[PDB]
C-alpha cells in the first residue's frame, strides 16, 4: 500500500501508463488510471513522464489519480519520483529508458517496415480460406499496391490450440504460402494462448500441466495440487489458457510456432490476446505471478520471432516487438487518436508502433466515409509502419483511391528517412514518431496532438477533419513544405488550403 503524492510544477504536463488512454492526456484534474490487472485494451507500462523532465517508475503496477494539481499514486510494490536535470520531456524519456527499459539493440523483421502491411481481417472476417486469401493478395498487386507482410487473421485453424491450417478451407496451405512468397509477400498468422477446452490439444496441455489452474477460491490450494483448468471468458467464448509463467508452456508454444514455420514456410505471428484482464480471478500459476506479468510473458514469445505484432502488452519497452495500436472504429474521433497514441507508445519504449488498420480495425464499424479512409491512410503513411485491411479498391471511388495510392508513394519517397530512424531506435530507443513536445520542448506544443515529427527534421501535419483549411503550428526555424517547395518562417501558426490529396509535411531548413 505504498503511496506517493506529487504536486505538479507550474505548467507541468504528465503522460504515461497506458497507450489507449493517450487521448485523456496530459492528465487533467479528475483523471484516473488503474494498471493493476488492466492494460486498457493495448500496451501499458508503470511509467509516467513530465514536460519538466520528471518521471515516475515502479517495477510493478500502480494506480494514478490527479486531484486538483496533485498526483496520487498507489503502488502494488514500490516506486519513486525522479528528475532529469535537462528539464524536458525528452530528458525524462531518455533517463527513464536507460534506467528501466534500455534499448535491446535489435529490430523486428525489416519487411514489416519496408512495405505497407495488409491484414485479411476486414475483407474476409471469419471466412479465412485459401482462395479468398490468394485473391486478396492478387488484388493488392493488380491495383498497383506494393507487396508486403500479409497477416492471415483469426480462424485459419480448426479450433483454438490447434496450430494447423483447416484442410476444409486450405487444401494446399504450403502451396498457398509458396505462391504468396513468389508474389513478394511475407506471411504472418494470428495466434493466441487460448485452448478450446474439450479438445485433444486441451487434454494434452492439461496433462502436461501447462495451463493455468482453477484455485477454487481456496486461499491454500497450491499450483502443484490443482487439477482443474481455469476457464476464461473472452470475446470468442470460453477457453482454457496457457500459463505464461510455466517454462513448459514456452516449450509447447515454440513447438507449435516452429512447426508452422517448418511445415508451411510461415514468416511470423500476430500475437493477440494476452490482455492482463484475462488472468484475473481464481487462478493459479506455476511461478505465482500477477496478471500483468502474464501479459508481459506472452510478449516475450515475440523475442523468438523477429516478425511479430502485439496489441496487448505490459512492459517490454526497448524490445524488438511491433506494437499495434488497438482496433480503431471507423470514426473521425478514432483517426484523431492515432498520433497521440503512437507518440505515447514511443515514450513508453514502443518505438516500432503501427497505428492499427487504415479506415478502422473494428469489423462491426463495417455508410462508409471515403474521406475518412483517405485521411486514415495519409496519417499512417509517415508513421513507422502502415497497415491496410479494408480493400481501398473495393470501397473507394477513383480519386479517393488515387489519393490513397499517393499516400503510399509519399511513404516510399520518405522510406530512407523512416528506416534511418527505425534502425537508430533499435540502438538508442529514441522514437521514430516523436511528439512536438519531445523535439520542441517548452515552445507551446504540450497539447499539439495533430502534428508529429518523423525523426528530427520532418514535421508531418495530416489533415484529420473535414474542410479545405488546415492550421499548422510551426516551431521557430524555417520550414519547407516538401510538395509545394514553399519556405515558411517558423514560430507562428499558418493556414494551408487543402484538398483530398494534401498531406502537409515540412522539412526543417533552419
Amino acid at each position: 500500500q505504498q503511496s506517493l503524492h506529487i504536486p505538479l510544477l507550474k505548467g507541468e504536463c504528465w503522460w504515461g501508463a497506458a497507450v489507449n488512454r493517450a487521448h485523456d492526456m496530459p492528465l487533467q484534474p479528475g483523471a484516473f488510471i488503474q494498471l493493476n490487472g488492466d492494460v486498457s485494451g493495448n500496451q501499458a507500462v508503470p511509467l509516467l513522464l513530465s514536460s519538466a523532465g520528471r518521471y515516475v517508475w515502479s517495477d510493478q503496477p500502480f494506480s494514478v489519480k490527479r486531484e486538483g494539481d496533485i498526483l496520487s499514486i498507489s503502488f502494488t510494490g514500490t516506486g519513486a519520483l525522479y528528475t532529469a536535470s535537462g528539464g524536458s520531456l525528452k530528458d525524462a524519456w531518455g533517463e527513464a529508458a536507460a534506467r528501466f527499459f534500455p534499448a535491446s539493440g535489435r529490430l523486428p523483421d525489416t519487411s514489416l517496415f519496408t512495405a505497407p502491411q495488409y491484414n485479411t481481417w476486414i475483407e474476409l472476417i471469419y471466412n479465412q480460406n485459401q482462395e479468398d486469401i490468394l485473391r486478396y493478395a492478387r488484388d493488392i498487386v493488380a491495383n498497383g499496391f506494393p507487396p508486403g507482410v500479409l497477416m492471415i487473421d483469426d480462424n485459419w485453424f480448426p479450433y483454438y490450440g490447434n496450430f494447423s491450417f483447416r484442410k476444409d478451407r486450405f487444401p494446399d496451405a504450403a502451396g498457398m504460402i509458396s505462391t504468396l512468397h513468389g508474389m513478394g509477400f511475407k506471411v504472418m498468422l494470428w495466434v493466441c494462448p487460448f485452448l478450446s477446452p474439450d479438445t485433444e490439444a486441451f487434454r494434452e496441455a492439461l496433462a502436461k500441466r501447462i495451463v493455468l489452474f482453477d484455485s477454487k477460491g481456496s486461499d491454500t490450494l497450491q499450483w502443484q495440487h490443482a487439477v482443474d483448468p481455469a476457464i476464461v471468458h473472452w470475446w470468442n467464448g470460453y477457453s482454457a489458457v496457457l500459463d505464461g509463467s510455466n517454462p513448459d508452456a514456452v516449450t509447447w508454444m515454440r513447438e507449435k510456432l516452429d512447426g508452422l514455420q517448418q511445415q508451411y514456410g510461415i514468416d511470423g505471428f500476430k500475437f493477440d490476446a494476452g490482455d492482463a484482464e484475462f488472468y484475473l480471478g481464481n487462478i493459479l500459476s506455476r511461478e505465482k505471478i500477477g496478471a500483468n506479468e502474464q501479459c508481459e510473458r506472452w510478449g516475450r514469445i515475440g523475442l523468438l520471432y523477429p516478425m511479430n505484432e502485439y496489441r496487448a502488452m505490459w512492459k517490454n519497452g526497448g524490445q524488438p516487438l511491433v506494437e499495434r495500436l488497438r482496433d480503431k472504429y471507423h470514426t473521425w474521433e478514432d483517426v484523431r487518436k492515432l498520433i497521440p497514441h503512437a507518440s505515447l507508445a514511443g515514450l513508453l519504449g514502443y518505438s516500432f508502433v503501427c497505428p492499427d488498420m487504415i479506415g478502422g480495425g473494428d469489423f462491426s464499424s463495417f455508410k462508409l466515409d471515403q474521406e475518412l479512409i483517405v485521411r486514415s491512410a495519409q496519417c499512417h503513411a509517415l508513421m513507422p509502419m502502415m497497415q491496410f485491411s479494408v480493400a481501398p479498391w473495393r470501397v473507394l471511388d477513383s480519386s479517393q483511391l488515387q489519393a490513397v495510392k499517393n499516400a503510399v508513394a509519399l511513404r516510399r519517397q520518405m522510406l530512407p528517412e523512416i528506416m534511418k530512424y527505425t534502425r537508430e531506435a533499435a540502438v538508442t530507443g529514441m522514437p521514430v514518431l516523436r511528439s512536438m513536445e519531445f523535439v520542441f520542448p517548452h515552445q507551446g506544443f504540450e497539447r499539439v496532438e495533430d502534428q508529429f515529427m518523423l525523426g528530427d527534421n520532418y514535421l508531418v501535419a495530416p489533415v484529420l477533419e473535414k474542410g479545405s483549411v488546415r492550421k499548422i503550428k510551426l516551431p521557430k526555424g524555417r520550414w519547407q513544405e516538401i510538395q509545394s517547395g514553399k519556405v515558411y518562417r517558423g514560430g507562428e501558426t499558418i493556414e494551408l488550403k487543402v484538398t483530398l490529396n494534401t498531406i502537409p509535411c515540412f522539412k526543417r531548413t533552419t
Copy 2:
C-alpha cells in the same frame, strides 16, 4: 415430498429403476437408488416391478430405499403402487408397460440385428481416420467375419458441435462410405449434444439461443433474459450444451444429422452423452424441464433415425431405440453383468438391448484374458444384438479366434428366432431376452442371473467363469441341448462338461 412405504410380501423380490444397478438386485436391505438427476451411467426409468405382480410408477424421478423388509419411495412428483392379479413378474411388467410405456409398433433398423455390429473405438481410439477405418473393415472381411453395422466412434470431426469429417484424417469421406457400403457395411457416426465453447458452432448456437443458459445461481433470472451459456464439465472437458427442451435445438440437430446423411450417405448415429447428471446446477432451459427430461428428450432424437444407439436414457420405454449397456471393463465381474443388466433393460421397456462391446468397452482396460473375450462373445451371441470392437484376430490365438467365429455361426443359425421375437417386441413390448423369473415364476429362479430365455423356448446358459464345469438350473419340463440332442428332465440342476467352444443352449420340448 410424497412417498410410499411398502412392506415386502413373503418371498417378494423387487427390480427396477436403473439398468446399471441390476447386479445389486433384487433390492436388498440397505439398498439406495437416486434417479433424480442420475441415470447411473446408462438407462433409467421410474418403475419398480416385483416377483409377486406388484409395481410402482411415477411420471417423474424418485429415490428408492429398502430398509429391513420395507421398500420406501420418495417422489419428486406423485406415484402409486399397483398389483397385477396374475401375481408374477411377467404380469407386473405387462400391466406396467400397457399403462405407462406401451410398445410403439416400430423396430430400429433391422441391419442392427441381422448381423454383428462393429465399433472402431477399441482398435482406433481417438485416431479415427479414413485409412484405418477401411483397414478394419477389410480385416473383418478377410478374417471371415460378416459385414454389419460399423460405428465410427468419437473424434471423426474437427471439434464438438462441428458435424463434418475432419479433412486432415478423411481426404474423401463420401468415397470411404461408398466403399464401406459396397463391402456390405452400413455406417453410423458418434454424436453428442456438447459444443466446443469458443468456436464458430458455439457462437452460432448461442446466437440462436439453442444452448442451455447459466442461471448465475439467481432464483429470478428467466431463460428469456439470460445471456451466458451453461458450461458443463464432462469426461472430454468443458463444453456448452444443447437445450433439448428448445424446439430450435431439435431443428439445429436435425439440420446437422440430415446433412451428414445427404452429403456423405451416413446410415445412422450413435448418440452418446445426454446423461441427466450433465444437466444439474445453475442452468436455465427454455421450457423449464428437469435434468432427467433433458436426457429423455435427447433420446427422442433417435425416433427420427431408425438406425440409432443410446447409452444414457430416461424413460422412452417401448420405443424403437437401441439401448446399449454401458462401457464394460475387461473383467469377469463385468461379463457377469451382461445378462441381469440386459434382462432388466427389457422389463423397463428396452427390448432392443445390446450388451456393450465384446471383451469390454472401456479403452483403459486396454494381460488380455483371451478366455474372457471368448466367453464375452458367446454371451453376446444369443442376445438381441452382438457388438465387437476389439479385433478378435489381433488379440486371440487360433483356437480362441475359432471359438468366437463359432459363436457368430450359432447366432446366424438362431437368427430367425431372434428376429421373430424382435419383431414381436416392437408390437407388444415383450422382451427378446427374458429373465428366468419372467418365464418361470415362483420356481426358485429369482436370483438366477447366469441364464436367460431367448423368447419362450430357448434357455441359454453361457459359461461365465473358468473351469470345465457349468451348473444349469432347469425349470420343470423337458429340455433338449441343441448341439448334443440330449434331453434333460427339469426341476433340478444339472452339471455339464464344457470346453472353450461350449455355449449351453436348451430347447423347451415340454
